Amino acid sequence: KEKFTSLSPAEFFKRNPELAGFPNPARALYQTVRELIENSLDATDVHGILPNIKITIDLIDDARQIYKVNVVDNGIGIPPQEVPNAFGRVLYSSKYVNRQTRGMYGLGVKAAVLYSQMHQDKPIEIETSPVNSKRIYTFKLKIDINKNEPIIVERGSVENTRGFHGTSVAISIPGDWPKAKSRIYEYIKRTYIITPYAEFIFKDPEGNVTYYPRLTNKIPKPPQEVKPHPYGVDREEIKILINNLKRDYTIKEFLVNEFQSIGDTTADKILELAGLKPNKKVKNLTEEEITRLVETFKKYEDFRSPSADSLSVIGEDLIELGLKKIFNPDFAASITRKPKAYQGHPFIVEAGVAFGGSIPVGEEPIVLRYANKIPLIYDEKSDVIWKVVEELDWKRYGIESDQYQMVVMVHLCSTKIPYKSAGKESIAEVEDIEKEIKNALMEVARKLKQYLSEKRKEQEAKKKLL
Amino acid sequence: KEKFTSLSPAEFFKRNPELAGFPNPARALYQTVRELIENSLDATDVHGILPNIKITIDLIDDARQIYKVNVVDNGIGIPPQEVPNAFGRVLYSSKYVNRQTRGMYGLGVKAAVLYSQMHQDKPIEIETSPVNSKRIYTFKLKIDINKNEPIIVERGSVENTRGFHGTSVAISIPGDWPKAKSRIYEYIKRTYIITPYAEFIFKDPEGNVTYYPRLTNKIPKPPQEVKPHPYGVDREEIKILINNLKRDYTIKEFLVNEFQSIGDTTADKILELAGLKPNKKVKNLTEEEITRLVETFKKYEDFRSPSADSLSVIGEDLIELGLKKIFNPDFAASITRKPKAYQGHPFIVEAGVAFGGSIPVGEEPIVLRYANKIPLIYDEKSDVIWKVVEELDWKRYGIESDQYQMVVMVHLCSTKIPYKSAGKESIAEVEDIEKEIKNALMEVARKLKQYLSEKRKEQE
């Protein structure tokens, strides 16, 4: 009959690699490159280190189309005791905390590792030296899919004669370079443009080398772990916060200590609206009381905004500088909005617009999407960003014709980006986010409208002379 | 400092509900409904039972927008010992076996259960009565997200005095009926049009009741568990197939017994190309030998197609009938293609085209997507099917003006549909499937050309 079984997280993604962005050899190569670059960047600028990143892709077997991808960085490294699980245990991560990072699932690199053993037989190769480490630790690893645990094939150590800090990861996978080429280059090119404090070197499978020089030695303030904002915190999150407590807080104490934007005044008001007794021990909250808290958090209209300390923005100057460098337009403008909250997570939307000049002519805007400083490249038409741009009436902001030369850019940064898939190429339809993307686009479009009404006014004056 | 931690599969989806199709209350309402209907259909037609399914959505709290979704079927039920894990352990399923079903992840209904727990306090309710059971077994359940296991709130039984056989599931969740309304109705409508042997009753939050009567009592042959096709079988899958052997097979015995489309002569060709000794014991394949086997599978050019049997198609007749019923076109045609293989899995693409008549005028085709008999409604433009339809030059097949009345329908069935997400609303870019979708569309496109040519000569 029907037979019931369970799977481990490794077997789940091994069975369904298209869920992590490994559906074909071209996209696999792209995904492997991007997960590694993202890890190296989280290991550097999140810790105040100006990134030096080296990427190499070598064709190691033309017949079988197997490529070896190697990414070397000057990050903080990884404690040797954590290396096995970091790369060989699905759903293991140092990024499950409330803080803006590129990684978030504790899936990324293991997905590439899984794809690697599914199609070839060489283990993945890791070399790492933590900050102030006397040694360089080496590993060769595979994943035991059934147990979802690391298999240490080889493990070793060498004397770190040069202070060296950082990580090298090398993984062999099926690939399709000709099909993946243009998007891999566009990925690196787009991250560089918004990361001018980093330096990249890229050697491709044909042996081309490209150099992306550091343009500034000023590093953005690192994002930090924060407490949740109360707006949108759910029932399960409340139970987690309660379970994590090491003191016998009252409900009032709980509210003031465990969240952002709650002082003694807001707290009293929340307790009253939620029908809760200030002095009750929070550990004794009932299932129904938890519900009332959550709904109260949800409908409360007077919360202060979260702070921006958990976030790292591109910023208006850089957005504008980048759009000008790439597109050489007649006009550019941008906006970094104030922080909002969704589902307890702080978030900011940034928007830019560029018009005219070297921008090609078309029937629709070129749309550049970024999430947590990652350039999104695939699945553009399923993105909530695309949904919002398409629904906006550009005619109301001066866009005359069917055909025009416009570029629209949107950056969402958050302690949590809600992607449509673990492949992280498109952003899901979360209403609070959709609304604030719309609001941001309206603010920049208003600036465009300003540029265009001046142009029309100039034209209208010159018309009289004809 | 970096602090390393682990998550259970429940915790992972509780943190990231958008990954299972729960990004907002409108889509969650929709997703909950379809996960339940699909479970009910997997529990009936896969077992030779004419499906009788009732769906009710009650608005239970206006201010909080909480809806109770209840689905009742006449399926095979669930063994009482399995109910807790079936609904309360993420990554638990009876569908991990190689066979065409609507479910496949062992996540579906539990994602709704998680979403239910995240926003309100009532537990899910299950009543079930397996075949020949003299009892109705009842449950109220939640999920312990940290442990990823069931919490049993209530559990009991009652004598089956009315002769109920099947399952009833009710879940309370935040929802948005006005936003979801048209899509829920479309999902049920399109299911019914391709499932004429099923009967549905739908009662909505406004009190409307719609009856979808059974039109035929002839069910397609139930899909069964089948052996993999060698083409695209990967290294980990080889190891699982060896690990599961009850007998000390040789590599040669392995090849002809464990796979589809491998005779004793085909095996010999493969053992030679792979450089493997026929009489070596397969339990002793080295890591490298497995590599060479898989590569050989991938490169071999003379494999028979998988068996068309044990996939369950809509069929050309039903496809055209459906198109004619919905759209009343001047012309319709369809094709059920011969089976292919991808990544070890048998699949078939079916394609339909309608033109003229009551079909609206527009600048692109209306595209109707189905996967394993499921109508796909969201994220159409990220779908591989849409990609192919968009890239086809319809000028080559007649499409004259820039404003035409055309419907294109594609159905992909397989022992495994490769979705873009566990939300299962769109098919990923798997190259073998993409090539076949294009080939299939070209076939029906030639029939359309014959019509559009045989119709211009009329105006001329």
Ligand SMILES: Nc1ncnc2c1ncn2[C@@H]1O[C@H](COP(=O)(O)OP(=O)(O)O)[C@@H](O)[C@H]1O
């Ligand atoms: N190059 C690197 N430098 C430092 N730490 C790394 C590097 N690569 C991976 N890690 C660590 O391993 C963990 C697992 O990474 P990954 O599987 O890609 O998931 P995620 O990035 O979502 O956490 C990361 O959280 C990080 O702590």
Ligand SMILES: Nc1ncnc2c1ncn2[C@@H]1O[C@H](COP(=O)(O)OP(=O)(O)O)[C@@H](O)[C@H]1O
């Ligand atoms: N209405 C039902 N009748 C019989 N079995 C069911 C029903 N609903 C769920 N199940 C069982 O519970 C299991 C888990 O369902 P689900 O979480 O939706 O995952 P999946 O459908 O992918 O297996 C199913 O595999 C099925 O065996």
Ligand SMILES: [Mg+2]
């Ligand atoms: Mg990562």
Ligand SMILES: [Mg+2]
């Ligand atoms: Mg299911």
